[PDB]
């Protein structure tokens, strides 16, 4: 995150940090959708060109962390992974189409004031909220506490013209008109993290997207691009129902 603001305590309880065990390294952001399931971007786990090829035993996640430098005993929790699931049609050689993955924890995590799951959208929610101009929220680390930025969804024709990458219906893009001031930006480093929106119908937070790649921030590009969560909800539901419990 760049040009963002300090998040308030417990403001993003579904925030998850994906780490490589050795050497210890923060790989990506992720999100909690249940006591045993975490959502992230596939490219965080599988990207051959850069030898990014992990199995469940190479990683771990930390949940409930507000500070990236201070160890919050009794608050933050560590969870090991039981299994990883990558969308069978995930395309990394071309455009990151269907850039999504699920990770099942070895043991259920205990919810608290700092650890709570986010909701996945249904048809009504997606249809009403995923429109140009409507703002969503992205959380990550500045580049010290968790940072936050609110960003407007961009018209699809505009998104397509702002990148050389082929944009599919399983993607959407957001961000400010760079020509309109020092605005916050989601960054490549925020990959895997959630893009959330609060429903005005039931006041619940829904994860509408997953940071797939960012062309602004530390590059001369314009927007951040996201995996369209609702468009892939059938796969998500299929996996949890078949391998959950």
């Amino acid at each position: 995150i760049v040009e963002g603001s300090d998040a308030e305590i417990g403001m993003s309880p579904w925030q998850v940090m994906l780490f490589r065990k050795s050497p210890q390294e923060l790989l990506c952001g992720a999100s909690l959708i249940s006591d045993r399931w975490v959502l992230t971007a596939a490219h965080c786990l599988l990207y051959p060109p850069w030898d990014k090829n992990f199995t469940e035993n190479d990683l771990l996640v930390r949940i409930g962390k507000h500070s990236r430098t201070r160890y919050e005993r009794n608050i933050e929790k560590i969870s090991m992974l039981e299994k990883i699931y990558i969308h069978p049609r995930y395309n990394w050689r071309e455009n990151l189409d269907r850039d999504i993955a699920l990770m099942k924890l070895k043991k259920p995590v205990a919810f608290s004031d700092y650890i709570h799951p986010v909701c996945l959208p249904d048809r009504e929610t997606a249809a009403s909220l995923l429109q140009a101009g409507y703002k969503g929220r992205v959380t990550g680390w500045g580049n010290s506490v968790l940072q936050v930025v609110n960003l407007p969804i961009v018209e699809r024709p505009v998104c397509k013209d702002s990148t050389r990458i082929r944009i599919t219906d399983n993607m959407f893009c957001a961000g400010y008109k760079p020509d309109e001031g020092k605005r916050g930006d989601a960054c490549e480093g925020d990959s895997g993290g959630p893009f959330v929106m609060k429903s005005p119908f039931n006041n619940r937070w829904y994860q509408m997207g997953i940071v797939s790649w960012g062309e602004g921030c530390d590059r001369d590009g314009k927007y951040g691009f996201y995996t369209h969560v609702f468009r892939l909800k059938k796969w998500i539901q299929k996996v949890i129902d078949q391998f959950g419990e």
């Binding site: 603001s5 308030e8 305590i9 417990g10 403001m11 309880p13 959708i33 249940s34 006591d35 919810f111 608290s112 004031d113 700092y114 709570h116 799951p117 986010v118 909701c119 996945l120 909220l129 101009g133 409507y134 703002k135 969503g136 929220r137 936050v148 609110n150 407007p152 929106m197 609060k198 429903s199 005005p200 006041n203 619940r204 937070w205 829904y206």
Partner: peptide, 29 residues
């Protein structure tokens, strides 16, 4: 926790809003 998903213990569950969520609501026009 599906039935309770999306409702923050320190905010929604106590009828409190964070510093910028109002910015999101206003954009729904």
């Amino acid at each position: 926790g599906e039935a309770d998903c999306g409702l923050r213990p320190l905010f929604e569950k106590k009828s409190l809003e964070d510093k910028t969520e109002r910015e999101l609501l206003e954009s729904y026009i």
